[PDB]
Structure 1
Amino acid sequence: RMSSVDIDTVMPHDLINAKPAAAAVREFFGSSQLSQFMDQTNPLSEIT
């Protein structure tokens, strides 16, 4: 994207995607074989 917009007479915070990688970190906790539901049934299961 930096080739289209003129670099001269520009500033930051505009040539940067708002959520270019936030979805990649949000999908990790949401859908992942490792990150699973919490077994919060008793104090022993919370520690095991």
Structure 2
Amino acid sequence: RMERVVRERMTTQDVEAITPQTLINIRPVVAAIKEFFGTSQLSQFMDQN
């Protein structure tokens, strides 16, 4: 998802003014990680009886 965003904005943004800080969007990566650890059938609640 982040790669789709970054290669969308490679073209629209002006050359010789950009840097990976301006290109990288970390919100979908952290969103994916948070969506995995919370609300997934494999990220199960730890069973301690």
Pair in the same fold by TM > 0.5: yes
**Separation of aligned partners in 1, 2:15 and 2:45:** 47
Matched, 1:20 2:28: yes
Scaled by the length of structure 1, the TM-score of the pair is 0.65
Displacement, 1:12? 2.7
Partner of 1:3: 11
Structure with greater Cα Rg: 1
**Separation of aligned partners in 1, 2:15 and 2:39:** 38
> Which contiguous aligned blocks of 4+ residues in structure 1 show a shift greater than 2 angstroms?
9-12
With CA pairs under 8 Å and 6+ residues apart, which has the higher RCO, 1 or 2?
A: 2
Give 5+ residue unaligned stretches, structure 1.
Answer: 42-48
Partner of 2:45: 37
Aligned residues: 41
Give 5+ residue unaligned stretches, structure 2.
Answer: 1-8
